[PDB]
Curated annotation (Swiss-Prot):
GO terms for biological process: base-excision repair. Its EC number is 3.1.21.2. This is Probable endonuclease 4. Zn(2+) 1 binds at residues 56, 96, 129. The keyword DNA damage applies. The keyword Hydrolase applies. Induction: Repressed by transcription regulator Mce2R. Zn(2+) 3 binds at residues 165, 204, 206. CDD domains: AP2Ec (cd00019). Keywords: DNA damage, DNA repair, Endonuclease, Hydrolase, Metal-binding, Nuclease, Zinc. InterPro entries: AP_endonuc_2, AP_endonuc_F2_Zn_BS, Xyl_isomerase-like_sf, Xyl_isomerase-like_TIM-brl. GO terms for molecular function: deoxyribonuclease IV (phage-T4-induced) activity; DNA binding; DNA-(apurinic or apyrimidinic site) endonuclease activity; phosphoric diester hydrolase activity; zinc ion binding. The gene is end. It catalyses: Endonucleolytic cleavage to 5'-phosphooligonucleotide end-products.
Length: 252
């Protein structure tokens, strides 16, 4: 499979070559900002290039929120992100599952996700990514993902499995791919991250492979079971070696 990394938005093609990455993932803007993504002077060059570029949508998007002042801007920035991703010829857009405010509102959160998807304008595919923390999430625990998918599974939405998030959620990595695919039928992208924290911590602190607490063989096995392209979302200095390790261990 293609193996790469999450890189700075500044010069994805140079970063990919420096890291030995076959694919990269970027944010278009500040990951934590509500400002619309800005057009890039290099858009035509990125669109023409062969390197696949995945776009991570801003972290504050919460399509499940009951708060109109969150939900409505979330839909708008997701629309803008998909348009900006198409402008650079991106492979896909990744968006986190989001959350509600309290456990009683989970089912309504699924319906808000469906409503957002019923209005989404995109020329590039969108993947939902699982999340790490205890937050009344739509997509932290796999039991919740199963209930979510009963509502949104027919929309065409894809799925990105993040191994650090899975670990932080308390889900076992040994059969995570099998369990997710029994629900979604699909894993379109893997974020292959070690974690600085113990299993089930609910914290999201990525680590270079082997620098954290997840046995690297569990990560390799998950990558092989999924078969999908891989993004290492790990610290800059160790990232070339992370990619090279996975490449060698998967026969890529
Ligand atoms: Zn993410
Ligand atoms: Zn991730
Ligand atoms: Zn994370």
């Amino acid at each position: 499979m293609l193996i790469g990394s999450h890189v700075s938005p500044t010069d994805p093609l140079a970063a990919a070559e420096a890291e030995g990455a076959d694919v990269v993932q970027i944010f278009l803007g500040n990951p934590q900002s509500w400002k619309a993504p800005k057009p890039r002077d290099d858009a035509a060059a990125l669109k023409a290039a062969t390197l696949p570029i995945y776009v991570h949508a801003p972290y504050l998007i919460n399509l499940a929120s009951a708060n109109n002042r969150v939900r409505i801007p979330s839909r708008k920035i997701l629309q803008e992100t998909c348009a900006a991703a198409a402008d650079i010829g991106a492979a896909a857009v990744i968006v986190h599952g989001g959350h509600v405010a309290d456990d009683n509102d989970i089912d309504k959160g699924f319906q808000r996700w469906r409503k957002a998807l019923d209005r989404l304008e995109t020329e590039v595919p969108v993947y939902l990514e699982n999340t790490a923390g205890g937050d009344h999430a739509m997509a932290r625990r796999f039991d919740t993902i199963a209930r979510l998918w009963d509502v949104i599974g027919d929309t065409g939405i894809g799925f990105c499995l993040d191994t650090c998030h899975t670990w932080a959620a308390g889900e076992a990595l040994t059969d995570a791919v099998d369990r997710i695919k029994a629900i979604t039928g699909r894993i379109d992208l893997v974020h292959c991250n070690d974690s600085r924290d113990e299993a089930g911590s609910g914290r999201d602190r990525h680590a270079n492979l082997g620098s954290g607490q997840i046995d690297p063989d569990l990560l390799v096995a998950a990558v092989k079971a999924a078969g999908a392209p891989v993004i290492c979302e790990t610290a800059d200095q160790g990232r070339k070696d992370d990619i090279a390790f996975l490449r060698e261990r998967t026969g890529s």
